[PDB]
Amino acid sequence: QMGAPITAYAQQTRGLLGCIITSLTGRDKNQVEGEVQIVSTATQTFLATCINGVCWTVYHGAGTRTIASPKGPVIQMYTNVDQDLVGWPAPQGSRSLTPCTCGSSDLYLVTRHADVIPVRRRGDSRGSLLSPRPISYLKGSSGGPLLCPAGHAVGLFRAAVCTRGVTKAVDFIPVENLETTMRSGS
Amino acid sequence: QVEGEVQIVSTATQTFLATCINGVCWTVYHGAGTRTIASPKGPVIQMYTNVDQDLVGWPAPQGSRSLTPCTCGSSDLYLVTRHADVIPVRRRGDSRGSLLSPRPISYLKGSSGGPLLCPAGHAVGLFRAAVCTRGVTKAVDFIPVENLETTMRS
């Protein structure tokens, strides 16, 4: 968010059984808050980020699926199979992040555990961890945001470079790839 | 539910702050000294006491969680007060930092032993004393995390 240091917390709203029933009915009456949403399909659990009034995540996780809302299942707004992107209209009550304009290379990744990991940009869609971590830690964090020192969105977490069970580098989808998915079509 | 990283501590005399980094509650020697912390099971002895670096440490209490030390080397620091206000600070050395907006001395009083965070929210150091000229503070003085990390390897 706007200025100050990036700090985060996590709140669980549903259990395994509660998730399964609302996945099949597609009806979710629960109240929504925050910028980042912890998503699930029962079988797999990951992350979703709100940038520009739209809730984005990875295609390798959600596919061509619908999101559960208070009015029933909501169809996707954007689907970009090649850039590994998916988008639905941001749920009522969620806050959106503004794309980065400062061009900084000191990125900060937010995990599902609500921890903030320091990342250094090493390319257009590549960055390296300042402290190498085990692969288990990064699991469930796909679709999560990479923030700049101001707390603005640089990109969404896609894949980790794993050698022996430890990850030294991360792979992401940059914010400019989102805006060209908005300007494209199908 | 809900654990704090920063504790608001008090002696018979003054009142200051205490920050949990790596399973241990740290604060300034000029506030606690060789004192013990209160717990429902009795007084707890200090795990570390470094009189030279103005450091004191006891094991982390109940209702607390630890801050992870900074690994990004950023110079854009942020001070957290006893009132929970965040002050932007620029690093001007190993243990020195300047305020972007010069505040009166009262504003910083009792915020010693508090943390100085980097943009990731990770601990860079502990607020020790404020640099005062005429009653207005323009800069701050701190104990960096690498002093805490060596005092542990001992």
């Binding site: - | 539910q1 002696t11 606690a32 004192r35």
Partner: peptide, 17 residues
Amino acid sequence: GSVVIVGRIVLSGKPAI
């Protein structure tokens, strides 16, 4: 005397359900 805890501060800003 001892050092007592008179309050706590959360950095994350977590409200508590």
